[PDB]
Amino acid sequence: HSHPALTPEQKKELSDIAHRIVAPGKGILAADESTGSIAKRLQSIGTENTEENRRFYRQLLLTADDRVNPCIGGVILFHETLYQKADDGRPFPQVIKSKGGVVGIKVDKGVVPLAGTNGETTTQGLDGLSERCAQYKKDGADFAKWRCVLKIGEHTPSALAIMENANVLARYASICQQNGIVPIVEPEILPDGDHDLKRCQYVTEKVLAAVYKALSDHHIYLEGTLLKPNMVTPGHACTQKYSHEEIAMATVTALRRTVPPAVTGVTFLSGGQSEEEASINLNAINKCPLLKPWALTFSYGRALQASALKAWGGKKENLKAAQEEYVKRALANSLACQGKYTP
Amino acid sequence: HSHPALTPEQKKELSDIAHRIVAPGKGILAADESTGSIAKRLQSIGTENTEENRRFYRQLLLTADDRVNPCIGGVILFHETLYQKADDGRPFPQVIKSKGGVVGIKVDKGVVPLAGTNGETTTQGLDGLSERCAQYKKDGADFAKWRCVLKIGEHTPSALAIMENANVLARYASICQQNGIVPIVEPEILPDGDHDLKRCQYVTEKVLAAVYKALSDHHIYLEGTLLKPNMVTPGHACTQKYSHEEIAMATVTALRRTVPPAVTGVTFLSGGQSEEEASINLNAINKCPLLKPWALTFSYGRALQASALKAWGGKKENLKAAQEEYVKRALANSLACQGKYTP
Amino acid sequence: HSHPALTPEQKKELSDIAHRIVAPGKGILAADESTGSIAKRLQSIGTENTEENRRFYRQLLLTADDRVNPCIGGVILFHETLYQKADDGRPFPQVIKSKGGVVGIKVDKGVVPLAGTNGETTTQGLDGLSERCAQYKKDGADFAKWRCVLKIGEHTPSALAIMENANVLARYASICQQNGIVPIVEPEILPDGDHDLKRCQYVTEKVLAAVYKALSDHHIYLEGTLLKPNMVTPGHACTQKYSHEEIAMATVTALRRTVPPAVTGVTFLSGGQSEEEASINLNAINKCPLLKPWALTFSYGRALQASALKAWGGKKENLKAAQEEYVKRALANSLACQGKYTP
Amino acid sequence: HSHPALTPEQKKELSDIAHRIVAPGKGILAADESTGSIAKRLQSIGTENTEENRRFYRQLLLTADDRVNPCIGGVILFHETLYQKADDGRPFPQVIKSKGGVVGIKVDKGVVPLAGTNGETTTQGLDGLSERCAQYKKDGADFAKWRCVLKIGEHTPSALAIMENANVLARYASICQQNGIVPIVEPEILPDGDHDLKRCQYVTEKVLAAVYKALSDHHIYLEGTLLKPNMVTPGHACTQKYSHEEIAMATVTALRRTVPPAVTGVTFLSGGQSEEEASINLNAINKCPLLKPWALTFSYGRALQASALKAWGGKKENLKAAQEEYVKRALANSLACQGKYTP
């Protein structure tokens, strides 16, 4: 017997937010880096990690030129960045919503190793999640993000890891959809190792199928859900070389065999690629001559901001130039969303 | 680790046959009625059930006018009809392939009641299936058909019935794809009882999701598979009345939430409807203003041939008129495939 | 491929602790009541809920006579009670270990309603659980407790609720076994409603089978795990009456059809029964003439302490008499562990 | 909601037959060899395979001395042997029931390779099984046998093979229990290759757990079911050497972690061992100092009859001596059932 999880108005908000995020030509900037990863990135660039430098760097990211207004539909933030204010006086969620963007927040509490596996981990962060999503919904967060990690090994991914990560993602998305927050499932598959297109495509099919079975099990309103997969790409130690067209064909085959078409949009990871390779691959994916009945766009953390961070270097007066650099990649990625990119 | 079930040439035959079957404007005639059901139908029309009458009736179905040549892409036969010859001397598979059609065969051995359930049955017919499909492949059968039955009850469909029927359908489709025969999965849901659009839509989602999970489990090449679902329609004793647009919206929602877009085409059942209601509903489904990234066509057993059987009556000299009647429905259903039908 | 979750020494501690807890004639006192439930219980008895009254009541429970030393193998505490000290100066974990008992702690963070179900809830409390169990392991907690809730309804327990609760229990037990803490799974089935012995026995089989499948999936070392089920008992509004022998037969049938015999012991709930009915039923269960290859004992929260709380009334000078009352039930329950109880 | 598969009288026959089969000190002779395997065995001994030689050899097996009357509780036959008569005039089922034995029949139709796996096969034989079991029940068959095959490889047994074989075994046992025939599940794991005690024990746990989950899913009355597993033994190419006590400890650990104690008895395979090694191992298993709450006995096809077949050689006049040889092993295996064997 059916007791509906959602009223039709709840489905209306989830569908409208998911359509406004993944709108044609728009993408996702992921400024959600935690203090450890951003500490590594500020230590590489050669500055001290303080709250002021992090706030100023996200100022450099967020208040860039109005040319990125038809580029970014939504920005993912850390928890701390929701309660930081810009030097103009405006809080960063209002900064995001003022230029048409949507506020999100990365909500997981890290990765926990699973017993008995070969280095396989699950994700943490389920306690207090309804109250926290209610609080973030009061502060203007309209979507969320959760990151599960899987690695390709000798006999990994085992069935235990895929089952547990799919069940956790479905539980998370149910809780987020209860509170009027569009969830984004991110089934990340680690690119480390040496494996061809074929095996990585294979485990991509198994992982995405288990995810969508668990989503059907937990009554998830799939019209208000976004998918964040990685492009099927060979391992870093894999010796074989492939054109970008084969990678695009393999991605669209791995999606067209799994993703049911009510899922509103597909946002890709960069996954340790270069700044240009991700845009080239996404432009290839948007040019693949099969029938792709959803939005195909980008959600790039490092691939948007890495070289702009390099051109910043920790000095304020370089800012505009660094900001200009960021805009460049954004504009390129916008063309990568519509297939009209050419390098 | 991946050991591929299919060579790329095997995928090439399966994809080419599935594309030739479900080709735009074409549909499926199901003349696959067994001796019991066709015995009931000949006893209703008032003639004796012999081999000659069955052969002559399928002669009346199969050698109709050439106007049905851009109508039927494929015909489903009983096992016996593959070894019957027409009075011209040509065997019925050659009759089908001569006018552009594709030969199929219904291969299941009936329904077996499941213990411990409330009148829920599974399907039979797995033994010797590789040899039988090899034999039918030698005789010109290029696709198959398997029919599982589920009924909506108080606490039915239980998880046991859906799991067992999905596993049996996946096992069947693996065996058929091994031998170069395009399988057609038919997840029939019984329209008996009293239940709204909502509950029947709900169990349609659960059943189709479990089916596609089991197909992903058994490495089924989904580009060479056809889907045969029923239209989500209220029960026969249900008191509420619905327009055809609501039924079309519910069907395309129940498909767009489940069917991955590499599945080549969707052929509907008639499911106890009238001869005109099925064409009206299919014309509505082809006019629904959502994105349907596959072929939507008909596979009508009774809805093509019932009134033509009535106009036959068991007398040979009425034949042409009866045949003319059949052509009428076929032409209508062809328009129901392209959305340009108007009654 | 097998990467062992546990070293053999880890299996040795888990097995030794589980054997010391469930040792023949010993049981579990559950003083783990949170502030809301114990607030209701102090408000029923007519005293104000303060930290001093709670500490003093658990003083009344814990420092009772030495006759309970061969009665209680282990005590379950709230988190707060681990950091309270007795008026002698000794902390309550040392009080427990001084008279032969083992310290436990209830670790879940409550129940969260599942979307789309009919009032079905999951359990919360997975974040930070490895660090918290490391901290409690430093403070002397050697076992844990987690409480999932399921209710018998019209079409409940659904498959979603049982699957999610089993996966959460297995994840919890893996985390606890990683840190050297013996987990106790508690699959509670709510006794509310009107349902016979038959349906409650049925859903007990389904729930326990799904739990043990999920435990086999997560590589749980079942020799170091305790099971905390409820006795299969009809609903509160059920009109049919049953002898205690039928309840004992149904419990031992529902366990002997599911529990694999390496699971070290089975501790029952009281589940809203009377103070005497639970002891009578446990004495019947220990007299059932089938082969029960594990320890069958009690884990009684209310059924040990309710009437002793009544004889306390909130006044200190009644203490000994109230404590004497507690000892009575404990002694009775000890006989209920060995089948030699007679009321 | 519960609709009981079995009336209590049906449970009474299944329990009584299962108790009479596995009765203390009794075992199973498996004369169920099909024409191919027995053709290989008659070709090794150097005689022509005819119906007369097969009938005469099973005469040599079945009408041996009355000292085997407290040895064999039941005999498994091929389908053909049920309709062969002895030269006295009595049919072989009456021969079996006259000396206290129970007639069984091997009912599967062979093994079929699974697509996409690495040499993994499922089992066949489900069609017409209710009618065939009704027919064999009329002829005196009171139990059955079904044989699924799994091999230990690099990345095998995969989850697909274990799931499919468990579902097929449960479906088979439901059908057999519907007709009043006690099923015997045989989850055979192939001993070929090189693998230690540890990995074979591991996959034994996974396989048996999946089997019992599928049996709980299909409402199987486990008091009327027998289990036929193999002893966990290293591979034929494995270099490490183990005492028989370690093999006995590993078997009883792999059973005590999985088998719920209502399953009436456990009958072992010989699995390519010597004639003496199987009896030594079973005598060790019956001497393992853990709590084994079921009957542990033998079901030996080759290990009972191989050397007796050797002492036959295809000549009639050697018969008695050959028969005497058979009795020897039987008597030894009877002691192997009670732990009082000493070689």
Cα separation values, D63 from C170, D68, D72, D144, Å: 54, 10, 12, 21
Does the annotation count B186 as an active-site position? Answer: yes
DSSP type of residue A294: S
b/e code A176-201 from CB counts within 10 Å (16+ = b): bbbbbbbbbbbbbbbbebebebebbb
In chain D, after which residues does the backbone break, taking C–N over 2.5 angstroms as a break? none
Q: C265: closest CA among A134, B5, D291, A170?
A: D291
* Solving technique: cryo-EM
Q: Which long-range contacts (CB under 8 A, 24 or more apart) does B161-164 make?
A: B161/B114, B161/B117, B161/B120, B161/B121, B161/B122, B162/B206, B162/B207, B162/B210, B163/B210, B163/B214, B163/D217, B164/B114, B164/B122, B164/D167, B164/D171
Nearest by CB to B124, from D115, D127, D217: name it: D127
Beta bridge partners of C300: C29
Instruction: Identify any residues that bridge with B298 across adjacent strands, giving them in sequence order.
Output: B268
Q: What is the distance of C-alpha A89 from the center of its chain?
A: 29
Binding-face residues of C in 280-309 toward D, CB within 8 A? 291-293
Name residues whose C-beta falls within 8 Å of residue C194's C-beta, 6 or more positions apart in sequence: C234, C235, C236, C237, C238, C239
CA distance linking residue C210 with residue C165, whole number of Å: 9
User: What DSSP state is assigned to residue D224?
Assistant: G
Six token digits for residue B293 = 């990234």
In angstroms, the CA A106 to CA A121 distance is: 18
Question: Which residues of chain C are within 8 Å of residue D259 when distances are taken between CB atoms?
Answer: 260-261
Domain residue limits at B303 = 1-343
Which secondary structure element, helix H or strand E, spans residue D141, and what is its range?
Answer: strand D141-151
CA D61 from centre of chain: 17
Residue type, A103: V
Query: Across the interface, do D199 and C291 touch by the CB < 8 Å criterion?
Result: no
Catalytic residue among D228, D241, D287, D316: D228
A126–C124: do the CB atoms touch at under 8 Å? yes
Distance CA D294, CA D23 (A): 10
Question: Which residues of chain C does A125 touch, with a Cβ-Cβ cutoff of 8 Å?
Answer: 127
Q: What is the resolution of this structure in A?
A: 3.8
Q: Tell me whether the omega of the peptide bond preceding residue D4 falls within 30 degrees of 0, making it cis.
A: no
- Find residue A31's DSSP bridge partners: A77
Of the candidates D109, D127, D219, the beta carbon closest to that of B116 is on D219
Residue D332 and residue D303 in contact, taking contact as beta carbons nearer than 8 Å: no
Please name which of A99, A107, A191 lies closest in space to residue A141, comparing C-alpha atoms. A107
Using the 8-state DSSP alphabet, how is residue D66 labeled?
G
Query: Other C-beta atoms within 10 Å of C90: how many?
Result: 12
The answer for C 123-162 residues in CB contact with D (under 8 A) is none
State how many domains chain D has. 1
Which residues make Cβ contacts (< 8 Å) with residue C75, sequence separation at least 6?
A: C28, C29, C30, C31, C62, C96, C101, C102, C103, C104
- Out of D199, D206, D257, whose CB is closest to C262? D257
Q: What is the DSSP string of D233-286?
A: ---TT------HHHHHHHHHHHHHTT--TTS-EEEE--TT--HHHHHHHHHHHT
Provide CB contacts within 8 A for B207, sequence distance 6+. Answer: B150, B157, B162, B166, B187, B189
Distance from CA of A293 to the nearest CA of B (A): 6
Q: Please report the number of interchain residue pairs, chain A to chain B, with beta-carbon separation below 8 angstroms.
A: 58
Count of CB pairs separated by less than 8 Å, A with C: 87
User: D216 to chain B: which residues are within 8 Å by CB?
Assistant: none
Chains that touch D (3 or more CB pairs under 8 A): B, C
CA pseudo-torsion sign B217, B220, B222, B225: negative
Write down the residue that tokens 């309660």 correspond to: A83
CA C96, CA C62: separation in Å to the nearest integer?
7
Q: Which residues of D touch B175 (CB under 8 A)?
A: 115
Residues A92 and A63 sit within 8 Å (Cβ to Cβ): no
Inter-chain CB proximity A293 and B261 less than 8 Å: yes
- What residues of C are designated binding site for beta-D-fructose 1,6-bisphosphate? 41, 270-272, 299, 302
Place of tokens 């055809």: B244
**What distance in Å separates residue D125's CA from the closest CA in chain B?**
6
Identify the CA nearest to C56 among candidates C331, C299, C303, C318.
Answer: C318
**Interface contact B1-D155, CB threshold 8 A:** yes
Task: Report residue A65 as tokens.
Answer: 């030129």
Q: Could you tell me which residues are beta bridge partners of residue B265?
A: B226, B295
Q: Within chain D, where are the H helices?
A: 8-21, 35-45, 51-62, 92-98, 129-138, 159-178, 197-217, 244-256, 275-285, 302-312, 319-338
Q: What is the DSSP letter of A182?
A: B
D222, two tokens: 């486990």
- H-only helix segments in chain B: 8-21, 35-45, 51-62, 92-98, 129-138, 159-178, 197-217, 244-256, 275-285, 302-312, 319-338
- Identity at C253, one-letter amino acid code: T
Q: Phi, psi (5° rounding) for residue A186?
A: -125, 95
- Please give the single-letter amino acid code of residue C104: G
For the record, the structure tokens of C12 come out as 């040795």
Reading phi first (left if > 0) and then psi (alpha if -120 to 50, else beta), residue C24 is in: beta
Tokens of D48: 């022509």
- Tell me which of C202, C203, C213 to substitute to probe the interface with D (most D C-beta atoms closer than 10 Å): C213
CB atoms within 10 A of CB D338: 13
Helix, strand or coil for residue A17? Answer: helix
Q: CB-CB: which of C198, C253, C293 is closest to D2? A: C198
Interchain CB contact of B238 with A (< 8 Å): no
Q: What is the C-alpha separation between B207 and B16, in angstroms, rounded?
A: 28
Between CA D182 and CA D180 the distance in angstroms is 7
CA distance B234 to D271: 56
How long, in residues, is chain C?
343
CB B145 within 8 A of CB B191: no
User: Count of CB atoms within 10 A of residue A283's CB?
Assistant: 22
CB contact under 8 A, D218 and B175: no
First to last CA, chain A: 55
Contact A240, A199 (CB under 8 A): no
From A254's Cα to the closest Cα of chain C, the distance in A is 27
- SS3 state of residue B42: helix
Segment holding C311, helix H or strand E: helix C302-312
Residue D234 to residue D198: CA distance in whole angstroms = 9
Estimate to the nearest angstrom the gap between the alpha carbon of D59 and the chain centroid. 20
Pairing of strands A72-77, C265-268: unpaired
The full DSSP string for D150-175 is EE--SS-S-HHHHHHHHHHHHHHHHH
Give the whole-angstrom CA distance, residue A97 versus residue A77: 13
Considering only the beta carbons, identify the residue of C210, C256, C262 that sits closest to D262: C256
Question: For B60, what's the count of Cα atoms within 13 Å in the CB-facing half-sphere?
Answer: 29
Planar angle of CA D23, C289, D74, nearest 5 degrees: 10
Copy the structure tokens of residue D214: 């599928």
Task: Tell me how close the Cα of C290 comes to any Cα of chain D, in angstroms.
Answer: 10
**Tally of residues, chain A:** 343
Q: DSSP labels for B59-101? A: HHHHT--GGGTTTEEEEEE-TGGGG-B-TTS-BHHHHHHHTT-
| Residues sharing a CB contact under 8 Å with residue A325, sequence separation 6 or more, in sequence order | A307, A308, A311
CB–CB of A118 and C218 under 8 A? no
D41 is in an annotated binding site: yes
SS in 3 state form for A75-104?
EEECCHHHHCECCCCCEHHHHHHHCCCEEE
Residues of B in contact with A216 (CB under 8 A): 205-206, 209, 258
Residue B108, classed as helix, strand or coil, is coil
CB-based contact (8 Å) between B110 and chain D?
no
- Which tokens go with D115? 């697509």
Candidates C164, C244, C243, C231; CA nearest to C204 is C231
What's the token pair of residue C130?
Answer: 């490895």
C-alpha to C-alpha distance for D262 and A163, rounded to whole angstroms: 30
Q: Which chains touch B (3 or more CB pairs under 8 A)?
A: A, D
Residue D319, both tokens: 């018969």
Are A217 and C163 inside 8 Å of each other by CB? yes
A193: left (phi over 0), alpha (psi -120 to 50) or beta: left
**Interface contact A174-C115, CB threshold 8 A:** yes
Q: Chain D, 41-60: which have a CB under 8 Å from a chain B CB?
A: none
Q: 């010993």: which residue's tokens? A: C26
Find chain C residues with C-beta within 8 A of A167's C-beta. Answer: 163-164, 167
Put simply, whether B205 touches A (Cβ < 8 Å) is: yes
**CB–CB contact B260 A262 (8 Å):** no
- Separation between Cα atoms, residue B279 and residue B269, nearest integer Å: 11
Check if the beta carbon of residue A82 is closer than 8 Å to that of residue A93: yes
Residues C143 and C181 sit within 8 Å (Cβ to Cβ): yes
Report the C-alpha gap between A303 and A309 in whole angstroms.
11
C6 in contact with chain A, both atoms CB, cutoff 8 A:
yes
What is the distance in angstroms between the Cα of B206 and the nearest Cα belonging to chain A?
A: 7
Contact at CB, B3 and D218, closer than 8 angstroms: no
Q: Burial level of C238, CB count in 10 A (0-12/13-18/19+)?
A: middle
C-alpha span between A286 and C29 (Å, rounded): 64
Residues of B in contact with A223 (CB under 8 A): 257
Count Cβ atoms below 10 Å from residue C119 Cβ, excluding itself: 12
Cβ-defined contact of D216 to C202 (cutoff 8 Å) = no
- Which amino acid is present at B306? A
Spatial CB neighbours of C222, under 8 Å, sequence gap ≥ 6? C215, C260, C262, C263, D257
Ramachandran region, residue B128 (left: φ > 0; alpha: ψ -120 to 50; beta: rest): left
Our CA-based measurement puts residue B72 at a distance from the nearest CA of chain A, in whole angstroms, of: 25
**Closest by alpha carbon to C141, among C75, C53, C187, C234?**
C75
Helix (H, G, I), strand (E, B) or coil at C29: strand
The pairing of beta strand D121-123 with beta strand D111-113? antiparallel
Q: With contacts defined as CB-CB under 8 Å, which chain C residues touch A117?
A: 3
- DSSP, res D230: P
Which tokens in the block code for residue C251?
Answer: 């419990």
Give A267's strand partners: A297
Contact B126 D130 (CB under 8 A): no
Q: Is C28 in a helix, a strand, or coil?
A: strand
Sign of the C-alpha dihedral computed for residues B148, B152, B153 and B158 taken in this order: positive
CA–CA separation, C24 vs D61, rounded Å?
50
